[PDB]
């Protein structure tokens, strides 16, 4: 039970809060937040998600901040921290004016037009890629890993990211559009190096295959997916009795065989080595097919058949009648049991469908491989975001200087009470720039005033300060880049978020 | 206690209308509803949320029922009638603080509520129709954002309005009215936005035959299916002999021929066409197009459904036929006047021409993205519910809020013709109305000070209605409040409404009013 303006102030109020200390923690240049745990246990952390957790929460707006975050965190992750930053700027500059004046409404719409004249500028401000040039992909990359200030390994993944997220990109709704991640496989591995480390075609299947009679390699037979039902059939086509006497072992069990084979030799219709045997797996099912010698790879996921059906790119199949490479193990494709590390690894490469690799992953060890996989995560996903998106901005403040100018402008123009979101909308841009100015440790009403200006005759399309180099900069020269969605990703969100507490003034329990 | 319950009463009354005035209707705000403590949920529309919420107070606990009493009728005057309930509550509460006796007046509001319903005698239109309760474009699109059903915003809007309200539809199984049962229709975005198209009978969405499949079979008796053929294993099927290694795998084959011959008779007896909600193999494909039948398969139960409901009577949705249609016994006929299996959006849907035995549409919506598929959707809805009141109501309330102002001074016409007390029956009664237009100005950012005192000032003795709205009522707004016509924006309802929420609110205030003592044993 929370009422009108006290929610539009505990709006203002905690999403103030809540914008706040982890811009201290953010820019490659950043100040790291200590979080002391009650019992003393301390924390540093430039990330906003793990820094909303140790925090007592209690302001279930805030909790919904919490929301929009793991929802931006589910989608990115990275500016989590920043989208709840211009939902702070937003709530906090026009809301108790324009509430005092006597509305959401009005701020409501705005934003609207707060998001279009961006997404307009954004399209602008942000400039196509070469996802055909991995390299000029890699820069991104080279830059995506970077704030958190790892690159010792990612140097390497960041090329790795943009190998098989390419190619783990097939993905079409007939518009094509491409979010595939799972197809991206990756893999844990003891020893190797953080320095060596590939993608390899199909989905590879490390996790829970590491099954020495899978054989090792197969060379052309194939790899079978069951949603068969080769669940032996005690009866005709039917299960019978159980055994509890000695009649029922020699009749059932010897029916229980057919239906095996029957499939097994559908199965054999396709001439597998490998089959991974997920619905209707039989203790006569393997042993059938290890007496097929054919090695039947039981007690194992469907998951690891949705890889496996990315690792052909097959589907899995149900019929029990006729089963077909087309139908499970599309494409000649390969299975093979590796070990790098001595860990048994089943590898099943060419996919029927090209752009097939996944990611293997070594490093000196698991660990400093997970260093790489943890920065590859990130590497890999704005590969996609790329792939997603291919237009980048210049970074910093000119992406954020840009459209205020032309939100001004149209505010200039658009004269209303409207006009004041979008003055209210205009300098939010410019708090990461602060940020910025703090990233550098500088002045901001300077820096601002001066961007301002640097937005009055360059338009600031390039140019922001940008705190690492410290200056009012050019940030295609310097080389600041995000594919534009992700941009708009962050900036896409604020608004709605703003928008969404903008709508309460009621909790209610 | 007395008034302090009485009070506590119509505070409670209008403790909890706090919530929903904000969160009232398509102008309210969206509102944070906690479950326990802990566990908050989002909307507008209190009528949704006071379920969902804990009712702490006796009247609130009188209230949450009522408002779902009039939700369980009909989303209308749920959110609201716990409104008036407030509303003269607070009004008569100094009434009977002033000389007013509980009972005395309260009969009168009732004698009042009937006034209203006095009023809606000579204020309704029968005609539900050709203006369109938000009107015909404004009910879509309103419901429509402006994206790719924008520029049709006004024009999507009369396709769908015209559509639902009478257009060529089966109702279910054919139920001789007005589309009761919504229409069968498509939002397939692709091509322009422009091509979206109401469409003879239904296209599906299915998948269509890929084995060859005949793309039309004219007049189909279908078989509509939502019994997946597909196969199992027979381990010994028809003949015996082995005399060749052929018939040694012929045998456990043959299961799957006489499919062939029975789809062969199933071409002679149940269907011309196979609609399968489920899967049809190719392999049972296979067994029809080679007679030359039409066999489509993974049909839309949507679809379906109302293609069954278009076919009529016999169908294979009923018993299972097996082993891909074990052959018909022909309880499994249905009927289409005719089958075109057309390329419509850039890919080929098998059009249902209406049914052999009953009118069908499909209406495809043609835009680019789902951006339609997901405005059109909401805009179907509306329009879709706005035309089923429509449909079930031909008399309907013409005016939003113009009749708040006509009601007000229809009954503080009425007011003074009593004399005495209960001439303040007929007058808070008409007070309570305006908050209507308040909460609505209130919602929008509006001020019905403004907006509810223009209302009061249009009449030529008295009614609503799109004649001379300078002169008279009709009508209003949501993003304003003030009066406006029937085919213009100005409001609607239905004709049934208002008593219920009438009688509602008209209880909601008395009875708790009639307690003193909460206290205890």
Known sequence: ?509 | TGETIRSQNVMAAASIANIVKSSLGPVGLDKMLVDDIGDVTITNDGATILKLLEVEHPAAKVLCELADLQDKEVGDGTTSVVIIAAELLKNADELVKQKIHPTSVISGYRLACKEAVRYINENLIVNTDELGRDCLINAAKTSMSSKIIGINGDFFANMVVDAVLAIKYTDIRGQPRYPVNSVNILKAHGRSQMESMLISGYALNCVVGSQGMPKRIVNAKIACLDFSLQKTKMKLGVQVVITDPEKLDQIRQRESDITKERIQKILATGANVILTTGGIDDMCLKYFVEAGAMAVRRVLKRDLKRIAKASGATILSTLANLEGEETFEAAMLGQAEEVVQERICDDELILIKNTKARTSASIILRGANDFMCDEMERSLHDALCVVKRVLESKSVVPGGGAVEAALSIYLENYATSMGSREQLAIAEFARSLLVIPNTLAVNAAQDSTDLVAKLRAFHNEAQVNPERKNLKWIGLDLSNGKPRDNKQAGVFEPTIVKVKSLKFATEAAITILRIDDLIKL
């Open chain 1, 1 to 509: 039970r929370e009422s009108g303006r006290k929610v539009q102030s505990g709006n203002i109020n905690a999403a103030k809060t809540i914008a706040d200390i982890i811009r201290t923690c953010l820019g490659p240049k950043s100040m790291m937040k200590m979080l002391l745990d009650p019992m003393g246990g301390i924390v540093m952390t430039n990330d906003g998600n793990a820094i909303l957790r140790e925090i007592q929460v209690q302001h279930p707006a805030a909790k919904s901040m919490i929301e929009i975050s793991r929802t931006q965190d589910e989608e990115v992750g990275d500016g989590t921290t920043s989208v709840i930053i211009l939902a702070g700027e937003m709530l906090s500059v026009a809301e108790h004016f324009l509430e005092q004046q006597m509305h959401p409404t009005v701020v409501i719409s705005a934003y609207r037009k707060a998001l279009d004249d961006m997404i307009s500028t954004l399209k602008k401000i942000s400039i196509p890629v070469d996802i055909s040039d991995s390299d000029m992909m890699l820069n991104i990359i080279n830059s995506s890993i970077t704030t958190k200030a790892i690159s010792r390994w990612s140097s390497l993944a960041c090329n790795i990211a943009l190998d098989a997220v390419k190619m783990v990109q097939f993905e079409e709704n007939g518009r094509k559009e491409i979010d595939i991640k799972k197809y991206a496989r990756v893999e844990k591995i003891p020893g190797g190096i953080i320095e060596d480390s590939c993608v390899l075609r199909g989905v590879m299947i490390n996790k829970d295959v590491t099954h020495p009679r899978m054989r090792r390699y197969i060379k052309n037979p194939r790899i079978v997916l069951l949603d068969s039902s080769l669940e032996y059939k005690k009866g005709e086509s039917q299960t019978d009795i159980e055994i509890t006497r000695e009649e029922d072992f020699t009749r059932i069990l010897q029916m229980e065989e057919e239906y095996i084979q029957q499939l097994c030799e559908d199965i054999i219709q396709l001439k597998p080595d490998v089959v991974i045997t997920e619905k209707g797996i039989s203790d006569l099912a393997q042993h059938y097919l290890m007496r097929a010698n054919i090695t039947a790879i039981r007690r194992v996921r469907k998951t690891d058949n949705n890889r496996i059906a990315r690792a052909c790119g097959a589907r899995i199949v149900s019929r029990p009648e006729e089963l077909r490479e087309d139908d499970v193990g599309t494409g000649a494709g390969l299975l093979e049991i590796k070990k790098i590390g001595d860990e048994y690894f089943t590898f099943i490469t060419d996919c029927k469908d090209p752009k097939a690799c996944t990611i293997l992953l070594r490093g000196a060890s698991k660990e400093i491989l997970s260093e790489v996989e943890r920065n590859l995560q990130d590497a890999m996903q704005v590969c996609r975001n790329v792939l997603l998106d291919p237009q980048l901005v210049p970074g910093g403040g000119a992406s954020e200087m840009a459209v205020a100018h032309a939100l001004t402008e149209k505010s200039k123009a658009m004269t209303g009470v409207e006009q004041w979101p979008y003055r209210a909308v205009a300098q939010a841009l410019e708090v990461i720039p602060r940020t910025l100015i703090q990233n550098c440790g500088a002045s901001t009403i300077r820096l601002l005033t001066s961007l301002r200006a640097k937005h009055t005759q360059e338009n600031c399309e390039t140019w922001g300060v940008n705190g690492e180099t410290g200056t009012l900069v050019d940030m295609k020269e310097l080389g600041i880049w995000e594919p534009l969605a992700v941009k708009l990703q962050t900036y896409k969100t604020a608004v709605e978020t703003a928008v969404l507490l903008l709508r309460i003034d009621d909790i209610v329990s």
